[PDB]
Amino acid sequence: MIVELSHPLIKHKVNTARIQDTSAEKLRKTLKELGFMLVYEALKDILLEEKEVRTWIGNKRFNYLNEEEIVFVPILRAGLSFLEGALQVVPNAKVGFLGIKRNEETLESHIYYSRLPELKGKIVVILDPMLATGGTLEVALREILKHSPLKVKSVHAIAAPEGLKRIEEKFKEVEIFVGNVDERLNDKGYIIPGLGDIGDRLYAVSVY
Amino acid sequence: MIVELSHPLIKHKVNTARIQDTSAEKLRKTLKELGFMLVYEALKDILLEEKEVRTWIGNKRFNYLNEEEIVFVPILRAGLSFLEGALQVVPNAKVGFLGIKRNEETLESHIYYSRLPELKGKIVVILDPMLATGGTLEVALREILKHSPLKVKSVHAIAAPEGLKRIEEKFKEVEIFVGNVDERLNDKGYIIPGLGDIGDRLYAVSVY
Amino acid sequence: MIVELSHPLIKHKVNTARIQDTSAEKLRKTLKELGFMLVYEALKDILLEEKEVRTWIGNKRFNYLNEEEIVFVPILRAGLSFLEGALQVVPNAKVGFLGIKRNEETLESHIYYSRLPELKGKIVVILDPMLATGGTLEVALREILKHSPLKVKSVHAIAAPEGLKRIEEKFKEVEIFVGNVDERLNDKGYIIPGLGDIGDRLYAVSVY
Amino acid sequence: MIVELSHPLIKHKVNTARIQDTSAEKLRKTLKELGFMLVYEALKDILLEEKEVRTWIGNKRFNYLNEEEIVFVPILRAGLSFLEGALQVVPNAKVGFLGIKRNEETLESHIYYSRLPELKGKIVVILDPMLATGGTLEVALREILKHSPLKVKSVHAIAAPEGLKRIEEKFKEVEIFVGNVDERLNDKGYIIPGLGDIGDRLYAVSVY
């Protein structure tokens, strides 16, 4: 189940990230603020738990989120741009790391780093700015669904119908949250209009 | 026009803020994150403007929020706990400051410090954790509406049906967003279950 | 006791803040980061206290700062730009607020808003980007020194010699920490090269 | 070139991190604020460059840091705890990623993931909470020095004497900035009193 968000400030953040003549500082801060918005939306169907706490007027009971039951998993590198934002929504959530890279020739993705915490029974939230062909997300899920997650959610700034197709086809139980679904993918597997080479725009030097 | 937010994460931030035995650091951080959510929600109906920018593939037109059209107005001191969260949603928004204080004997509010930028034609978003008797918000609006704002929004973590009444009776054109409408006001004008003396809990020493 | 910090990153943050064609977003972030540096430098001679804590390998004794012993006092409006960064150094410090504004004819200042926590025996750290004539700091000091604080420190991005001389002359006990001591003060009481109308550049509309 | 920092606030941040009973939220925030400090100290010798800019009073010439000429390199996953803090001092620096993992039997480190921007002629700053045996850092340097960086700096909250010795013995040109030099390494290659398993304390679950 795919879900495209329509909030005007998500569009703003997304479109603000499209602007190539912005500094890396601005891009990073924009995606972090977007990550907060995305994870916030993705957690709108979370169930709270009643717990007794202490207030200024004595003991009382209120509903709370079991922050520890949430596990964020950013795909380095771009996934990382969302992590700080995601943690602001859920400060005590665990964090898993997947080092993945797409083979620009075959368009396939491979895992070179995996440092995941105990995922069994918890709610996992994948973090990755773009969803192009879906190769990276497919390999990420493959690596994650093995630990028997309770539920897997994924957040992205933009997505290509191409990727949305396969994903929702081979991973129907996965919840996909997207800031904006773009037009298509080109001959090189880049989302159009997309964000170009965000990985390098974020932490290196963009070629555009 | 009152709107009570029902998002489970807002309820979590609010209740977390209800916890008296937390550190000032935790309270400030909690309310900063809640502020982001409250402002995010409050701008769900914001109108975007189309502008041309240079993307990685070339000049394209996308809809953007005119960040400078929004003006945040935190009521000192508590309102300040939402400022950073709000500025994350709209980084280049203008900021107005209102130094107000409630007489704990009559429960009347008075303005001691006013430093507001041009509000003429802009969307003003007032920030202040609690809306109890509505006194402080009334005085604030009284001086704000003069600048002939285009629209005035208000965000609060909690509010009492008491305050929501008068405010909506003398300022019906003002949109009031609240994380959770509490039960009532006590003998001393405090909200129940409310948050207590957050001002002192946030920057000084709580008397509870 | 005047101290002109010589750290290249402080100079950079200062000079960066001098750039007139930067967004409010960028300037606010610049100053927040500069604020962290200034307070860090201003607390280099702070005393730590031994306390027993539990580590991964059992109880142990280490030296810790008594965070609640420090009080940050931002002078609205400009001084608020330091508050966020100042709190990163000392998260649980107390926060006092002073709404002061300078009379642009006599070059003297008046306090319109004062909300301070207990200051007796505490270490007060005044926050305010500029120290021009020093009229604002003087008025702030008068108001603070009455509460008998254990020590008073002040951080500024920049300052004019005439301003410094004026403060150190009457307050030989106050420690002034400045990112850079500029050239002089023009006939209007503005520091040169200075930062211009910082308050408005930060939260409203600059006239330059 | 090794350098043990003595600033009380660094000591405080470092010692606060030793508190095993703190939430992941508190630890992450503490290390972020510490990372800022460590990097701030590490760039104290940084060289600035003169550039002409537009100020409120016209064009002027000031010294600035060429932010882009700086490259931060955290070692996953612990190194990530200093990233944001490090980026606060140099917002536009480039970011390199090194996925490393120590073998708990031989205490050897191996690089499974590498995503580095162009390091040739730049100032590289490695980020890693601890520096126990030196294996992780040694491997890292050997892939970084190959790019012929202008200079290499490294920051750590704590380091074991034996770790510092091999490093300084194999990389005399590398500047190692340490928050506090602990006592030693145990039989399992853990620093004492050390921080335990910070990687798990930060993003997963600690066994202590």
Side-chain angles (χ1 to χ4, degrees):
Chain A
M1 143 106 153
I2 304 176
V3 177
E4 189 184 9
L5 304 175
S6 61
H7 195 300
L9 279 151
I10 283 184
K11 301 303 184 182
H12 180 54
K13 298 296 185 184
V14 175
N15 295 332
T16 297
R18 295 189 200 268
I19 301 186
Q20 183 81 19
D21 50 302
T22 52
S23 64
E25 186 183 12
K26 175 68 176 179
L27 216 208
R28 292 160 188 177
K29 193 176 175 294
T30 301
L31 294 184
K32 167 191 175 183
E33 305 176 320
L34 168 62
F36 184 118
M37 297 176 172
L38 297 174
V39 176
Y40 173 71
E41 292 287 2
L43 291 180
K44 186 177 175 60
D45 65 321
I46 206 70
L47 189 65
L48 305 179
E49 179 185 300
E50 185 176 65
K51 299 179 180 179
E52 196 180 24
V53 305
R54 181 58 164 294
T55 72
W56 64 296
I57 50 181
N59 292 122
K60 300 281 294 181
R61 288 182 185 293
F62 300 99
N63 296 315
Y64 297 80
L65 168 66
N66 295 305
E67 290 186 36
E68 280 103 299
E69 291 297 299
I70 297 182
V71 180
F72 289 124
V73 172
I75 301 82
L76 305 180
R77 302 170 306 166
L80 185 63
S81 62
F82 286 155
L83 187 53
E84 294 307 77
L87 294 173
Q88 294 184 259
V89 314
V90 188
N92 294 288
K94 305 298 177 180
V95 183
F97 313 78
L98 291 176
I100 305 174
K101 184 182 184 305
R102 197 180 73 172
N103 178 304
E104 299 311 305
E105 281 294 67
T106 69
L107 294 195
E108 295 180 298
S109 296
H110 306 286
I111 301 175
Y112 284 78
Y113 188 71
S114 186
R115 217 74 164 62
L116 307 179
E118 190 164 296
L119 303 179
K120 182 173 173 297
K122 295 193 176 182
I123 301 177
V124 186
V125 188
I126 312 299
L127 310 177
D128 215 346
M130 301 191 292
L131 201 57
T133 71
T136 287
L137 181 60
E138 197 179 75
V139 185
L141 297 171
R142 187 188 188 69
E143 178 73 1
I144 299 174
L145 282 298
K146 290 181 174 298
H147 295 66
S148 290
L150 177 55
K151 193 177 182 185
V152 184
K153 293 167 177 284
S154 200
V155 301
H156 319 279
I158 61 176
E162 326 293 356
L164 294 178
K165 286 290 188 177
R166 60 186 295 186
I167 296 298
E168 201 183 20
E169 176 169 348
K170 264 299 185 65
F171 300 106
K172 52 183 179 180
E173 63 179 4
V174 178
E175 299 189 306
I176 310 297
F177 288 80
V178 191
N180 190 78
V181 301
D182 281 16
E183 258 48 75
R184 53 156 212 301
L185 287 174
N186 56 35
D187 194 57
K188 292 185 181 181
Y190 306 143
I191 300 179
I192 307 300
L195 303 173
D197 57 341
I198 25 74
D200 289 347
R201 293 187 58 203
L202 276 168
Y203 315 115
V205 177
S206 165
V207 292
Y208 301 107
Chain B
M1 301 169 273
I2 302 174
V3 180
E4 187 183 8
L5 309 171
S6 70
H7 199 293
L9 266 159
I10 285 180
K11 300 298 179 180
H12 173 65
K13 297 299 180 177
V14 178
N15 300 323
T16 291
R18 294 176 182 294
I19 308 177
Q20 188 65 21
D21 64 305
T22 61
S23 68
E25 181 185 19
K26 175 64 174 182
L27 208 195
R28 296 167 185 173
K29 190 166 177 290
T30 294
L31 292 180
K32 166 187 174 176
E33 306 166 329
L34 171 54
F36 188 127
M37 296 171 180
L38 299 180
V39 184
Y40 175 62
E41 290 289 359
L43 297 180
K44 186 177 186 59
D45 73 318
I46 195 64
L47 233 13
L48 302 181
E49 184 182 304
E50 188 174 63
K51 301 185 178 186
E52 184 175 5
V53 300
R54 182 186 72 87
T55 76
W56 62 291
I57 53 177
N59 296 40
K60 291 269 291 179
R61 297 187 195 294
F62 296 96
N63 291 304
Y64 294 78
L65 167 62
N66 293 306
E67 290 185 33
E68 288 120 300
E69 286 309 296
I70 295 180
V71 183
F72 289 119
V73 180
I75 298 84
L76 311 172
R77 314 152 288 163
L80 219 54
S81 61
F82 287 151
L83 194 48
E84 286 297 72
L87 288 176
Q88 295 184 84
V89 191
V90 186
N92 288 294
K94 304 303 178 184
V95 186
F97 310 73
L98 293 175
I100 305 176
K101 191 174 304 178
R102 182 179 87 173
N103 182 305
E104 296 302 293
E105 289 290 63
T106 64
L107 303 181
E108 308 178 310
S109 286
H110 327 93
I111 292 181
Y112 291 109
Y113 179 67
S114 180
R115 211 77 169 70
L116 299 163
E118 179 178 289
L119 303 182
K120 174 195 174 194
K122 293 193 174 184
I123 296 185
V124 180
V125 180
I126 307 307
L127 318 175
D128 192 30
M130 299 189 289
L131 181 50
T133 76
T136 290
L137 178 59
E138 187 176 71
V139 186
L141 294 173
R142 193 172 296 297
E143 184 173 1
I144 291 177
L145 271 324
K146 294 186 173 185
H147 294 57
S148 306
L150 174 56
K151 194 179 190 184
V152 182
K153 296 174 181 291
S154 179
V155 304
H156 311 282
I158 61 175
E162 317 289 0
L164 290 176
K165 283 289 181 179
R166 56 179 296 185
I167 292 301
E168 196 183 13
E169 187 170 0
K170 323 182 199 175
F171 299 114
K172 58 179 181 179
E173 4 72 60
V174 181
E175 301 181 307
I176 311 301
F177 300 84
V178 300
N180 188 79
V181 298
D182 283 61
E183 311 181 308
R184 65 175 189 297
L185 285 183
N186 82 324
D187 193 352
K188 298 184 180 183
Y190 279 83
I191 304 178
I192 298 294
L195 291 169
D197 61 335
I198 30 78
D200 284 352
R201 290 182 57 197
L202 276 165
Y203 313 117
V205 173
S206 171
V207 294
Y208 296 91
Chain C
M1 303 175 273
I2 302 176
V3 179
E4 186 186 13
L5 302 170
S6 62
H7 195 301
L9 264 300
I10 288 180
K11 301 305 184 177
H12 175 70
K13 296 296 182 180
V14 169
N15 301 325
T16 299
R18 299 182 188 286
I19 310 178
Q20 189 62 32
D21 55 310
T22 53
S23 62
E25 183 181 14
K26 171 63 166 186
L27 207 211
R28 285 172 192 150
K29 189 157 175 297
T30 296
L31 292 185
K32 166 186 172 182
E33 282 148 12
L34 169 57
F36 182 124
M37 303 179 170
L38 294 174
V39 178
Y40 176 69
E41 293 287 9
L43 297 183
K44 187 177 176 64
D45 69 356
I46 202 66
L47 239 53
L48 301 186
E49 180 174 303
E50 183 176 67
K51 304 179 182 180
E52 190 184 9
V53 295
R54 191 180 81 71
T55 74
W56 64 296
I57 55 175
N59 294 305
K60 280 282 298 181
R61 294 179 186 293
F62 296 99
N63 298 307
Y64 299 80
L65 176 69
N66 298 308
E67 291 188 37
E68 285 89 309
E69 286 302 298
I70 297 339
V71 177
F72 287 121
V73 183
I75 293 74
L76 308 194
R77 294 165 308 152
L80 176 69
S81 56
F82 276 174
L83 180 60
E84 266 303 66
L87 291 175
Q88 292 185 262
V89 184
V90 190
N92 292 285
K94 306 299 181 180
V95 180
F97 309 79
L98 297 180
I100 301 181
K101 169 176 211 314
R102 190 180 80 174
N103 186 330
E104 293 306 303
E105 204 224 52
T106 70
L107 291 196
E108 302 302 320
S109 300
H110 309 285
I111 302 180
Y112 300 110
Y113 179 68
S114 179
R115 213 73 167 64
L116 312 169
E118 193 32 83
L119 300 185
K120 179 176 180 300
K122 301 285 186 171
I123 297 179
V124 179
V125 181
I126 313 235
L127 310 183
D128 199 18
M130 302 192 300
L131 179 48
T133 61
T136 289
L137 182 55
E138 193 179 74
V139 179
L141 288 173
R142 307 182 72 65
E143 172 66 4
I144 298 177
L145 280 293
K146 305 178 183 168
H147 303 89
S148 181
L150 169 58
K151 196 174 188 181
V152 182
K153 293 166 180 287
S154 185
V155 298
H156 310 282
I158 63 177
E162 34 273 71
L164 300 174
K165 189 188 192 65
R166 185 269 189 64
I167 300 294
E168 192 189 11
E169 219 167 72
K170 337 175 156 180
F171 298 104
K172 54 192 176 185
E173 61 209 322
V174 181
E175 304 178 302
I176 304 296
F177 298 81
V178 175
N180 194 74
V181 175
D182 281 16
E183 291 153 36
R184 67 170 193 295
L185 287 182
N186 80 311
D187 181 49
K188 303 182 199 191
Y190 307 142
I191 304 173
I192 304 294
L195 291 170
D197 54 336
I198 20 85
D200 290 345
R201 287 181 64 205
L202 288 172
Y203 313 117
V205 180
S206 171
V207 298
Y208 302 97
Chain D
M1 201 238 185
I2 298 179
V3 178
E4 181 178 1
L5 305 174
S6 55
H7 193 298
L9 286 161
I10 284 179
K11 299 303 181 185
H12 180 67
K13 298 298 182 185
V14 166
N15 295 318
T16 295
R18 300 174 186 288
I19 305 181
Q20 188 60 38
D21 304 300
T22 61
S23 61
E25 183 184 4
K26 174 65 174 184
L27 211 199
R28 296 168 184 168
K29 188 168 177 295
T30 297
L31 291 190
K32 167 184 172 180
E33 310 173 324
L34 168 55
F36 179 124
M37 297 177 185
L38 293 177
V39 176
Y40 175 69
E41 293 283 3
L43 298 177
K44 182 177 178 61
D45 69 315
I46 194 64
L47 234 84
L48 303 177
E49 183 191 313
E50 191 197 70
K51 295 177 178 182
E52 184 178 359
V53 301
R54 180 69 67 185
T55 73
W56 63 293
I57 50 177
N59 287 133
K60 290 297 188 64
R61 281 186 161 64
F62 298 101
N63 296 311
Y64 295 78
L65 166 71
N66 292 306
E67 287 188 31
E68 294 105 307
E69 292 300 302
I70 297 176
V71 180
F72 287 127
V73 184
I75 289 84
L76 311 162
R77 330 153 273 168
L80 174 62
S81 69
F82 292 157
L83 200 41
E84 285 293 66
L87 292 176
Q88 297 187 90
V89 307
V90 191
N92 291 286
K94 302 299 179 180
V95 186
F97 304 79
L98 286 176
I100 306 182
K101 203 170 305 178
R102 190 180 78 172
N103 184 300
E104 292 313 300
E105 280 289 66
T106 66
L107 296 182
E108 292 172 51
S109 297
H110 181 54
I111 299 180
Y112 305 73
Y113 178 67
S114 189
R115 210 73 160 70
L116 302 172
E118 199 162 305
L119 308 180
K120 175 166 194 17
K122 295 195 175 182
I123 302 181
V124 186
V125 184
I126 303 192
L127 310 172
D128 205 3
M130 298 189 291
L131 180 53
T133 72
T136 288
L137 180 58
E138 193 184 71
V139 92
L141 291 181
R142 291 269 198 232
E143 177 164 352
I144 302 175
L145 279 303
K146 286 185 178 184
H147 294 67
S148 179
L150 175 57
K151 201 175 182 184
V152 179
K153 298 169 178 294
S154 186
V155 301
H156 318 281
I158 58 175
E162 37 279 73
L164 300 172
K165 204 175 149 201
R166 53 179 296 185
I167 294 300
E168 190 177 6
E169 183 172 358
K170 270 172 228 179
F171 304 101
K172 45 194 176 186
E173 60 182 1
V174 179
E175 314 187 311
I176 311 303
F177 297 77
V178 174
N180 187 76
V181 303
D182 273 32
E183 274 148 49
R184 63 177 185 293
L185 292 178
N186 55 47
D187 178 51
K188 296 184 178 182
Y190 272 96
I191 299 175
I192 298 300
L195 293 173
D197 55 339
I198 30 66
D200 289 355
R201 284 182 62 196
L202 285 166
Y203 314 120
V205 179
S206 178
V207 292
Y208 308 109

Short mmCIF file of all heavy atoms in Angstrom, two decimals, chain D residues 80-104:
data_model
loop_
_atom_site.label_atom_id
_atom_site.label_comp_id
_atom_site.label_asym_id
_atom_site.label_seq_id
_atom_site.Cartn_x
_atom_site.Cartn_y
_atom_site.Cartn_z
N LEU D 80 28.97 8.36 13.57
CA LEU D 80 27.84 9.17 13.17
C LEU D 80 27.35 10.06 14.30
O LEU D 80 26.67 11.06 14.07
CB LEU D 80 26.70 8.27 12.68
CG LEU D 80 25.36 8.91 12.33
CD1 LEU D 80 25.51 9.88 11.17
CD2 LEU D 80 24.38 7.81 11.96
N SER D 81 27.69 9.70 15.54
CA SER D 81 27.24 10.47 16.69
C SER D 81 27.89 11.85 16.78
O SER D 81 27.40 12.72 17.51
CB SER D 81 27.49 9.70 17.99
OG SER D 81 28.87 9.58 18.28
N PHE D 82 28.98 12.06 16.05
CA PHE D 82 29.66 13.35 16.04
C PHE D 82 29.34 14.17 14.79
O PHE D 82 29.57 15.38 14.75
CB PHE D 82 31.19 13.18 16.09
CG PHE D 82 31.73 12.63 17.38
CD1 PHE D 82 32.97 11.99 17.40
CD2 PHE D 82 31.05 12.81 18.58
CE1 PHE D 82 33.52 11.53 18.60
CE2 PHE D 82 31.60 12.35 19.78
CZ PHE D 82 32.83 11.71 19.79
N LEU D 83 28.81 13.51 13.76
CA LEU D 83 28.50 14.17 12.49
C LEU D 83 27.80 15.53 12.57
O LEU D 83 28.37 16.55 12.20
CB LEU D 83 27.69 13.25 11.57
CG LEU D 83 27.72 13.61 10.08
CD1 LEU D 83 29.12 14.03 9.69
CD2 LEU D 83 27.28 12.43 9.22
N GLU D 84 26.55 15.54 13.04
CA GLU D 84 25.79 16.78 13.14
C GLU D 84 26.56 17.86 13.90
O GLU D 84 26.63 19.01 13.45
CB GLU D 84 24.44 16.54 13.81
CG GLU D 84 23.42 15.86 12.91
CD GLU D 84 22.99 16.73 11.74
OE1 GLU D 84 23.84 17.01 10.86
OE2 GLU D 84 21.80 17.13 11.69
N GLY D 85 27.14 17.50 15.04
CA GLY D 85 27.89 18.46 15.81
C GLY D 85 29.02 19.02 14.97
O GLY D 85 29.26 20.23 14.94
N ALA D 86 29.72 18.14 14.26
CA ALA D 86 30.83 18.54 13.40
C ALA D 86 30.33 19.44 12.28
O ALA D 86 30.99 20.39 11.90
CB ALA D 86 31.51 17.30 12.82
N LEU D 87 29.15 19.13 11.75
CA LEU D 87 28.59 19.93 10.67
C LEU D 87 28.12 21.31 11.15
O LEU D 87 27.88 22.20 10.33
CB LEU D 87 27.45 19.19 9.98
CG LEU D 87 27.90 17.95 9.20
CD1 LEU D 87 26.70 17.21 8.64
CD2 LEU D 87 28.83 18.38 8.08
N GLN D 88 27.98 21.49 12.46
CA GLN D 88 27.56 22.78 12.97
C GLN D 88 28.72 23.76 12.91
O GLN D 88 28.53 24.96 12.74
CB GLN D 88 27.06 22.68 14.42
CG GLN D 88 25.82 21.82 14.59
CD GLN D 88 25.27 21.89 16.00
OE1 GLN D 88 24.43 22.73 16.31
NE2 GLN D 88 25.75 21.01 16.87
N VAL D 89 29.94 23.24 13.05
CA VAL D 89 31.12 24.10 12.98
C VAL D 89 31.44 24.39 11.51
O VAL D 89 31.78 25.53 11.16
CB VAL D 89 32.34 23.43 13.67
CG1 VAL D 89 31.97 23.02 15.08
CG2 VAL D 89 32.81 22.24 12.87
N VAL D 90 31.34 23.38 10.66
CA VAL D 90 31.59 23.54 9.22
C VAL D 90 30.42 22.93 8.44
O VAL D 90 30.51 21.81 7.94
CB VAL D 90 32.90 22.83 8.78
CG1 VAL D 90 33.26 23.26 7.36
CG2 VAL D 90 34.03 23.17 9.74
N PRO D 91 29.31 23.68 8.32
CA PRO D 91 28.07 23.30 7.63
C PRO D 91 28.18 22.83 6.18
O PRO D 91 27.41 21.96 5.75
CB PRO D 91 27.21 24.56 7.75
CG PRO D 91 27.68 25.17 9.03
CD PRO D 91 29.17 25.03 8.91
N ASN D 92 29.12 23.38 5.43
CA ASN D 92 29.27 23.01 4.03
C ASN D 92 30.45 22.09 3.73
O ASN D 92 30.89 21.97 2.58
CB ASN D 92 29.35 24.27 3.17
CG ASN D 92 28.02 25.00 3.11
OD1 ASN D 92 27.09 24.57 2.44
ND2 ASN D 92 27.92 26.10 3.85
N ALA D 93 30.97 21.44 4.76
CA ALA D 93 32.08 20.52 4.56
C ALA D 93 31.52 19.31 3.82
O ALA D 93 30.31 19.09 3.80
CB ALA D 93 32.66 20.10 5.91
N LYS D 94 32.40 18.53 3.20
CA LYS D 94 31.97 17.33 2.49
C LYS D 94 31.94 16.19 3.51
O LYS D 94 32.56 16.29 4.57
CB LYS D 94 32.96 16.99 1.36
CG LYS D 94 33.15 18.11 0.34
CD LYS D 94 31.85 18.47 -0.36
CE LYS D 94 32.06 19.61 -1.35
NZ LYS D 94 30.79 19.98 -2.05
N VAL D 95 31.21 15.12 3.19
CA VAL D 95 31.11 13.99 4.11
C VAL D 95 31.46 12.67 3.45
O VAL D 95 30.91 12.31 2.41
CB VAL D 95 29.68 13.87 4.71
CG1 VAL D 95 29.65 12.77 5.78
CG2 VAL D 95 29.23 15.21 5.30
N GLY D 96 32.40 11.96 4.07
CA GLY D 96 32.81 10.67 3.55
C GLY D 96 32.33 9.59 4.50
O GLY D 96 32.20 9.82 5.70
N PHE D 97 32.05 8.40 3.97
CA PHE D 97 31.58 7.31 4.81
C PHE D 97 32.46 6.07 4.73
O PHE D 97 32.86 5.64 3.65
CB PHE D 97 30.14 6.94 4.44
CG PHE D 97 29.18 8.10 4.49
CD1 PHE D 97 29.12 9.02 3.45
CD2 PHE D 97 28.34 8.27 5.59
CE1 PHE D 97 28.24 10.11 3.51
CE2 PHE D 97 27.46 9.35 5.65
CZ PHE D 97 27.41 10.27 4.61
N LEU D 98 32.77 5.52 5.89
CA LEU D 98 33.59 4.32 5.98
C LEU D 98 32.93 3.30 6.89
O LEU D 98 32.85 3.49 8.11
CB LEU D 98 34.99 4.66 6.51
CG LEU D 98 35.93 5.37 5.53
CD1 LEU D 98 37.24 5.71 6.23
CD2 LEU D 98 36.19 4.48 4.33
N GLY D 99 32.44 2.22 6.29
CA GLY D 99 31.80 1.17 7.05
C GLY D 99 32.87 0.22 7.54
O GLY D 99 33.42 -0.56 6.76
N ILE D 100 33.17 0.29 8.83
CA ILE D 100 34.19 -0.56 9.42
C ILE D 100 33.61 -1.42 10.54
O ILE D 100 32.59 -1.08 11.13
CB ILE D 100 35.35 0.29 9.97
CG1 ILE D 100 35.87 1.22 8.86
CG2 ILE D 100 36.47 -0.60 10.49
CD1 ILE D 100 37.04 2.09 9.26
N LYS D 101 34.28 -2.54 10.82
CA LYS D 101 33.83 -3.46 11.86
C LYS D 101 35.03 -4.21 12.44
O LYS D 101 35.82 -4.80 11.70
CB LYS D 101 32.82 -4.44 11.27
CG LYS D 101 31.86 -5.06 12.28
CD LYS D 101 30.76 -5.83 11.55
CE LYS D 101 30.03 -4.93 10.55
NZ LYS D 101 28.97 -5.65 9.79
N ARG D 102 35.17 -4.17 13.76
CA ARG D 102 36.28 -4.85 14.42
C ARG D 102 35.95 -6.31 14.71
O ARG D 102 34.82 -6.65 15.03
CB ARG D 102 36.63 -4.14 15.74
CG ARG D 102 37.93 -4.63 16.37
CD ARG D 102 38.25 -3.92 17.68
NE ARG D 102 37.46 -4.43 18.80
CZ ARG D 102 37.65 -4.08 20.07
NH1 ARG D 102 38.61 -3.21 20.38
NH2 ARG D 102 36.90 -4.60 21.03
N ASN D 103 36.96 -7.17 14.58
CA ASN D 103 36.79 -8.59 14.85
C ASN D 103 37.08 -8.78 16.34
O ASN D 103 38.20 -8.52 16.79
CB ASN D 103 37.78 -9.41 14.01
CG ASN D 103 37.59 -10.91 14.17
OD1 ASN D 103 37.71 -11.45 15.27
ND2 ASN D 103 37.30 -11.58 13.07
N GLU D 104 36.08 -9.21 17.10
CA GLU D 104 36.25 -9.40 18.53
C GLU D 104 37.15 -10.56 18.95
O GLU D 104 37.33 -10.80 20.14
CB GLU D 104 34.88 -9.54 19.21
CG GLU D 104 34.08 -8.25 19.18
CD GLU D 104 34.91 -7.06 19.61
OE1 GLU D 104 35.40 -7.06 20.76
OE2 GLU D 104 35.08 -6.13 18.80
#
